[model samples]
Every structure is written in C-alpha cells, then in structure tokens.
Target chain A: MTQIPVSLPVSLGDQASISCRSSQIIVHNNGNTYLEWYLQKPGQSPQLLIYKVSNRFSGVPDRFSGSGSGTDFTLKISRVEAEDLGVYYCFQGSHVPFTFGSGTKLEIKRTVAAPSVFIFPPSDEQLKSGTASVVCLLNNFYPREAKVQWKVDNALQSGNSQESVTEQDSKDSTYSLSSTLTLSKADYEKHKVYACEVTHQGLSSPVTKSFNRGEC
Target chain B: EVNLVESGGGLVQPGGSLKVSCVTSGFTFSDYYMYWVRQTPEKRLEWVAYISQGGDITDYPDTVKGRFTISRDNAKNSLYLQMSRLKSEDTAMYYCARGLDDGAWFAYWGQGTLVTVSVASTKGPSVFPLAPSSKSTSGGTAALGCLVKDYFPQPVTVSWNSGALTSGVHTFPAVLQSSGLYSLSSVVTVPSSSLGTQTYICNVNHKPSNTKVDKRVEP
Candidate 1:
C-alpha cells in the first residue's frame, strides 16, 4: 500500500483528507471491499475507523467517512479536532495476506516542547554476574512521541531492554518515558561513555545525557 | 555450548496448514524459554509467538493471536509452531531462539527454516496448440506444439492422447517466470497422412493445485 504526505498539518475544524493506494485489488469476490481505516492515537492503541470501504466502526462518529474503489481509497475527516491527532493507516485485507499502508501522521501544527533527558548509571549493587543496566528518563515532552538512542562512545548502539510506553502526565499533558540499556561489566569497567539521546519533533537537536563508570 | 536446529520447511498451498519444529540440545530444555520469530523478504523481524520452558504458558502477538499455536515436546526437546490458513505473505525464514525472561531476549538461535507459501492461481494452465511448422509440413510430417503457461509449483505433467507416441516427441523443461509462475512447451512430430481424420489432445496435470486441463487440435 502507498500513502503520501508523511505528515499532514491541519487546523481545528478543517477538513482533512488522507489517501491510500493498494498495489492489488482490494475487492473480494463477494463484492465486499476489504479496505480498512485505522487511527492510532497518541499513547493509545489503534482503533478501527472504517471497514469494507465505507462502513463506520462501532462507536465511530459520523465525521469520518471512507470512500474508494479497487486500488484507490480515501479517508475524509469532515471536522478535524484535537482527538483526531494521531497516525492514520489504511489496511488491505483483500490480498497479499493482509497488508498495512505506511502511516500518515496528523499534526496540529502547534509549538512542541523538548523533553528533559537524564541518564542514571547503575550502582554496584545493581550489577549481576557481569552485566549492568543503565536507565534514561525523558520527561515533559510535547507531541507525545519521542525517540531514544543509545550511543557508546559516540557510536550508535542497540539497547537490550524494552522502551517503556510514553505516559501522559495529568498536570502538564506532556509525555514521559524511560529507556534501559544493558551494559556488560567489561564495557562499563573500561570507562566507555554511554550517551542517551532523545529526539522529538519539537527540538532542533536531540537532547543527550552522558554517563560513564565513574558516575556509578 | 547451546545449539538450536529448526526443521519443517516446504511449499504449502494457500489456505493450507504448516508446522515447523525447533529442536535444541547442549542445555536444559526446561530451563530456557523458546520464541518463534520470522524475517520477511524485506528483512523485517516479526515476533510470532513464544512458549515457556515448562510448556504450560504461551503467549502470542496480536497479529497471530488465534491463528498461530506454539507448543512444546519436552521429551524431544522440541518446540513447534503450527498455523493454518497460510497465505502468500506467510512466506518467510522462521527462527527459533532461546531466551529466559518470558521471551524478552534471545541467546541461541537455530539456523532458520524457509517456508514458501504457494500463490493460488485463479485459473489453471492455459494450453495453446501452436501451428504446424513449415519444414515438417513439407517433409510429409506434422510437428505439433503444445504451449502451457502460467502455472505454479513447476511440476506439471503434459502428455498426448495418442498411444505410445514417443519417437519424435520432445518436451522442454519448465521455465520460471518473473511473476513466480512457470511455462513450458512440448512438440510432437507424426506422419501428416496418418493424422488425416484424427485429432491430437494435450493434457496437463498440475498436482499441486490438483487441476487438469486439456486442449485438442485437429491436424
């Protein structure tokens, strides 16, 4: 499936139209269009908006409408509101074993604030067998999405632990998340610096926090 | 000194069922959890399911929650992934890995088995009878050609309706197409006067889809 305009900016109460194109025909032999529309809200699970081209899902509002044919389809939002801010994906269940389109982000085009990033080095008590775990906490970021990167001595590295979900703070409505990187004792004792870099759409550059064995 | 070996890879038709196994050794089977992962043609990793070492607990991702089954055979030190209603997108290289923390990480992995889900063809092979060659017509013989195209699994049997006519019959190997299908052609030469009032038939048997198609021509 092909979807264009990776990021769509819309104002409040304006109409938003997203397009999706499938490589194969999405119509089944029974005359049912197997195309579906989904909305993934910020920090929430994806919700089905439309199924079989134009039918509204349960509890879906009438503002959203799906229209399309075999390979071309459209999802039109008559009135874009704050609740509609998220990614929209078109799924095809007709062929090729159920595929999804590249998501299209719906942005509100407002100013976003960068999150404060910090890294906490594991203490001696936290070390087990030859490994240590380091945690990075990112707090108070706008737009709700943040990417965490672990760099070893300025080189890109992979983290072994799962990144926690971005939780919405009740007071500020910003997002906070924690990312953990497991480090071997040998590497930690070698005094190699580990940097936790956080990337957000609001920030011009990524905010990074560095730590080493001495910090422990 | 841990090793994992995966087996059970083959061509499965659309909507068919498949089961792959991952056998391990050099470590206690009941001590480490097992995971079933797949790599797509685009090199994307997808987590299918996982089972605890004791075989009493299992977890599946929402993408394959009800469709996939993760079971274990502790006596054989083997874990199996059984799935039904396989589709073309199910073709991938599946790996079985060993981990501990409820399937968060992987320590040892098998060599990986490749499962190819055959594409379902809406129509059977189309057989076309080619025109008799000019050279054969002038030599008092008729060279008949049967062209079969657009078939899957590549194991089609083509035969003529005539009785034991193998002297001047030539069949070429099936050639794979860019579309993942196959095509082949066969030719048979016979005396022109001997086929005056008779007709020749080309029968194609594609066992993978269990389809039979025939084309008849009068020469």
Candidate 2:
C-alpha cells in the first residue's frame, strides 16, 4: 500500500515521468476499473499500458500518457528516444507480483555530477546452475545512510547477500538494497566478471557495477 | 516473404502420444493461422490454440478441450500438433504460433518444442519439426523458423505479423538445430511504403494447447 519507486534519466528527446502509489484503488472484475500498466522493452515483449487505470492501449500514443487517482499513478513520456533508452518498468495488472516498479534507467548523461543507480541481473536461467541474485536500488537520496556491497573476482565476498535498509519519509529521501551471489555460473560465465558495490554517504565513487552471465 | 523450418527434439513414454510440425515459407499456402504455447518451470505462459494453413481449429482455456489436435497442409504451409494423454505435467517449453485471434499475442515465435514424458515406452506419436518456414522477398527481408522436435528442454517464443503493416515488429534469436530443431528468425523491412498487395503473417503459439498459421506474399 506504500510502494513508491520512480527514477528516470531519459534523453533522446527527453521528457519522462513515472509514478505509482497504492493505498487503495482496486476494482474491476466488473466493478469498473482502477489498474493496469505494463511496458517492458529491453529484449522486448511486454507491452500494454493504462488499461482500466486510464485506458489507452490500442495503438498507444498520445505521446504515451496516463493520469492518476486513488492510489496515485502516472506514466508520461513526451519525447524520450534512443528507442527510448531501456529499463523503464511499471506493472500492477492490479495485483500479483504483477507488481514490478523499481526500474528506470535511460542513459546518456555521462556526468551531471553523476549519481543514479538501479541494477538487476539474474536470469539466463538464473545464471545457469551456480547461484545468482542481484538487486541494487537507490531512490531520492536524502540522508538515509544507504549501503550495499558484494564482489566476486574483485575480492570483497563473505557469503554476499544483503537487503534490509528501507526508509522513505519523503522530502527527497529513499533507499533500497539487495545482493546475493554464490558463484560458478561457470565462474560467472567463464570469468566475465561480477561486482555490485555501493556505499553512500551520498556518492563520490564506490558504485562498482559489473556482470557477465553467459557461457554454460 | 514467408518461412518456417522446423524439426527439433522429442521423447515420450508416460502414457504417450505426440505430433509436432510447423513448416512454411514465402507466401501461398492458404492465408494464415497457426499457434501453440507452453512455458513451464513456472514462469507461467500458456495459450496453445489456432491452426489453419487450411486446417481450421480453435481451443483455449477450457483446459485444452479434448486432449489436443490441430492440423493443416495447404500445399505444405504445414501446421500440426497432436497430443493425447501424456504427463510429467506435460513436460513443457513448447511453441509454434502465427496470428489472428485466439487472443492474438505472439506475433511469431517458434524456437521451442520440448516434450519429455518417460517410462520406457508408455505410448507413441513422436514426430518432429520445431520451426521451418523459409524463403523471402515480400516487401523484402524475411526468415522464420521454430523447432523443438523432442525431450522438453526450455526457452521458447516467436511472434511476427504483417497484415496492415502495423509499424514493423521484428524479433529474432532461436538457432538450435539438429534433432529437436529450434530456429527462429524475423526481419521485415518491407517499407517502400509497403509495396504491392500486402498480406504477411507468420504466427505460432504453443502452451497448453497449440495453434499455427502461415501466410506470405510481397514482391
């Protein structure tokens, strides 16, 4: 009921907005409408936006927009291109893990004082046999003490896996972290690499980031 | 342009019976409509229904009404899926789809066909051809193939349609040939403003039931 995750970088034409807040707003079995919005595009497949929440999904394009109401929801993308970057997710077919939103990364901003993170990797059949689990999310940043770490071929590893740092009072403040690794998806797919280090006192370096997941 | 080159992997025993085929290529072969879908390991994706190169059939949801059976052979714009009582929870990862309602989802996907049910030999009907529908030049550029001849492995999804142009949609990555065939390819750039009388459809959906459709013409 208190779920909020929106982090957009967008740049091709620029203009992006994402919002999802639920406390109440669920109807439709016939009771009318209140949710549905799915748009996943990286490897493709998964397209449907605003259905019963605000409608729209026939040919989709009014510059792709959707309003909000009860639980508060929004998804707008006026220009945004480069094929509209990647990793922009929002799901709530009204329920279920039909619940996904913690993804927004539309690159092209080398450094504007660089500081934006959201990563998820673990699939290729969950890194073929070995062990894998990755989730690193940081939103809003304001004075939350956020910290998450794990490294494989770059040292730092003691059973790696963390997630228990949630805080959001708003006023520009948010945090989320998760990491899990066991290794040998054939040594990270024949040694491509692996890393997910994030330390926050509000960024300066220590963002790490590396992955392979192939070869087995 | 149209194409579907199938023949992959398969094996059955536990009270078995199976039949799989999806072959097509560039145009002709009685319009279109062929599908099937099944993805398990609990990622959840099921639709299995639709077949008509001229075989005409439809089934969905109703738990795959009556075992399963769909056929077509309009001059070999081939399409078929016959299953009768096999279980290991029907060992999944099966696909073969085209287009035109049953709820029209997959635009074109078939690089999957893995049916594994064992015991030694509990029944029969294992024939393969995962995805085979090739040859192109219908508005230019084309390739379509899907195969999972036998022994349920995993990973499958093929979808493509060109009936009203619908703003170019292409997806590719399915090349597992030899035995339980699995080959998928889609490349449609046919835009000289979509030249001459159009009609390009290649669909395959495989899940609980099975559906298939194929059509091509554009030069």
Candidate 3:
C-alpha cells in the first residue's frame, strides 16, 4: 500500500528530497502510530534511519527528517553528502500484513570539495643548498583549479617554480591534487619558517598551513 | 563510583516470586543511595525503591508500600529489590541508579534487566495529579506524593528534583498488583526550614526510553 517514484539525481550540498505515501492504509489511530523511514546505501546496510515517525536511530545525524500522517509522508535529507546518495524507503506496521514503499533511489551529483592543503619536506630529491623544495600536498578535494601561494616570515615568495598533479578519487567521485614549490635552501635559511596558503571559492577564508624548521 | 548491574530472567508467570540483585563496585558502603527503576512496553516509567547504604528506606509509594522491599547487603555492597506474587504484567526492563544526595537525582544508572510478564499487554507508567496531599501552617512541613501507576516489570524512577537543601526525604519501594503490574508512591517531606513560595517537581525518569515526566507543585 506504499508507493514512491523512481530515481532522482540531485546535486551535492543541495536539498535532495523524497516523499512517501500509503494507499489503502489508515493514517491516524489515536496517535501518529506505525510510521517509519529507512535509507539503504551501496555495498552495506543500516536501514534504520528514522523510526516512530520522527525519532532517529543512534548516531544518525539530525539532518534527516520524517513527517506526515496516515496516508502521505515525506523523508527529506538536507545538504546531501556523498554517502547520502542511495535508496530510501518507508514502512507501515500499524496493522497485520505490514507494507513498505518500493523505494526512491537518490543519485547525488558531485561538487568540487575545498582543498585541505599541507606543506612538508620532500622525499624525491636531495636537500642541497639550491635544490630544496617545499611539497604542498592538497588532498581529498574537488575542482582541479586552486591558487597555491607560499610565504616566508610574512612575505610573498618568489623565484620557486610551482608544479601540480591531480589524482581522482575513483570510489567517492572526488579528486586530490599535489603542488610542489622548488626553492633554494638559502631561501628557507633566511626566515627558518615557511607556510603555504590555498585559495578556493568554496572556502570562506583562504586555507594556510605553516611549518617551523627548528620546532616539532 | 558506583556501577550497578541486574541479574535476572526475562520471563515471569503470574503470581510467582521474583528477586533481582544489583551488584555494585568502586565505592564505600553506606555512603550513597541506590535506586531501582523500571519501564514497560507502553513507554511509562516508575521509581520502584530507594535504599540507603545502611539498609534504611525513607518512604515508599502507597501502590508498592507493603509489597516491594528495597534492602542491601552491606558486607557485599549489593542492593536487592525483591518482589513477591509477580504477575504477567510485571515484564519490564529494570535498572539501578546511584547518587550521593539521597534527595537529588541519580547521576549514575545501570544498563537494564529485561523482564517479560507473559501477558496480553504490557503498559508504561502514569501519574495521578494534585499529589500535594497537605501543607502545614504551624510545623511548616509540606507532605508531597507522586502516585505512579499501571506498569509491569517496567519499573519507574522518581527523582525528587526540588526539595530542601538538606531536608529529610522518604522513598517507598514499588508494590506488585494482583494482575501482574507494578505501581508506586514516592513521598518527599519538605525540609523544616522555610515556608516561602518554594515549589518542587517529582521528576520521573523512564529507563530504556530516554524520555521523562516532571511533576511540579502549582500555585
């Protein structure tokens, strides 16, 4: 007695919603009884998303909501994460011979994730006077294009050639990038402290990471 | 530093004897109060009994006044809640809570003991309103009661949230009904200090379910 439409592809960090309605079923019986919702992801299972109309399962975040009475209902997931793209369902157990909604599969569209930038000592080459390089590893992010800027003792860096490489996250539909800053040992010896600043439109403020040569 | 655990079976027939033990560790005996709380399928809660470390009870609800016994074995640091003539409606989850202040809410609680009273229906707890039976003008001591009823094996917990700072409080153990359920009355005698506009709430906490009901004295 429950019916739901087919797959609906939505975008990441956007409002992705679904509605569940039951036909030939009594909706209200003194209390808003016998209403529940569930979500099934790929490769594994933990179908208990919501229960008793609004009560969520343990550890399930509060972004999800289950509403409506006897015949019509809605299960909305706000700001969809990558893991939220999956099939959702509804079950009515108020009477004998319980029933369940077929399912509403959600396909989440990918968005460019902001870069988590890091600068560290390199392993590829020897640490000579003029051959020193600061490796900036930008990991687990979307959007291949990002501005990488380096500073030493609060001054903009220059003369170091910048190189970048991107790797796709096949499983989760995101991307990762690594940028290198080739500089001379004399450049770091002057300040003894260097930092990398990353600029992305998705991030409110520019992200920066600093490193000190003498301190851990 | 008190951790309590219940050791009992889940199934009980009508009119049978039931005795459950709450084992505790990590504290000195006779230093704190121990409580037994229960919940039923109907989502109700009740405070069954409170035991002083020295095996003395302040008071008990009238529903369970004579039937339930809250006592302890000081030598072993164990609190026992014994019920006689059990009924099918006695099925519920039993939990134990401990605290330093006998008149305050319990800060520590046990997991729960699932008790089923093989009956047609299992019910939660309920409160009878206007529990403030009488107030005194000369002695200035107020008598208050929380009438919690209609729950099986599902025991309830009564936490006297409002009372005198160091007033004398009484807790009665839960009583068993003839049909297989449990009910209780918890009385908190107002401290003999002030006769001001001081009110109190009988906070009833239901185990298994995280929800609770608080009873307050209104103007």
Tell me the tens digit of each residue's lDDT in model 3 across B1-219.
546777764556676667888888887757887877665544334456777667765444554567678888888888787776676556666777675332223445576777765644446666532223221111444444454555655557776663333243333445555446665555444644532466666777655334367766431
What lDDT is obtained when candidate 1 is compared to the true structure?
0.68
Please list, in the order the candidates appear, how each scores on TM-score for chain B only: 0.56, 0.22, 0.51
Checking candidate 1 for backbone clashes, the offending pairs are none
Question: Could you give the CAPRI-style class of model 1?
Answer: incorrect
Arrange candidates, best lDDT first: 1, 3, 2
Q: lDDT, candidate 3, residue A85?
A: 60
Which runs of model 3 end up more than 4 angstroms from their true locations? A1-216, B119-219
Q: Candidate 2 — what's its lDDT?
A: 0.49
| Weakest lDDT window of 10 consecutive positions for candidate 2 chain A | A166-175
Can you give the TM-score per candidate against the true fold? 0.40, 0.26, 0.30
Candidate 2's displacement at residue B216, Å, is 56
Q: Compared to the true structure, candidate 3 yields what TM-score?
A: 0.30
| Candidate models: Cα lDDT each | 0.68, 0.49, 0.58
Best by TM-score: 1
Clashes of 1: 0
Tens-digit lDDT string for candidate 2 (B1-219): 445544543667667788878776665647767767665433334556665555655654456657778777787677777877877777776667564232233445555666766553322111111111111222233322122222223333445452444333333333333434333333334434344544555444434223333434233
> Model 3 over residues A57-141: C-alpha lDDT tens digits?
6567888886776677677778877777656767564543444566776765467687555455422222442445555555556
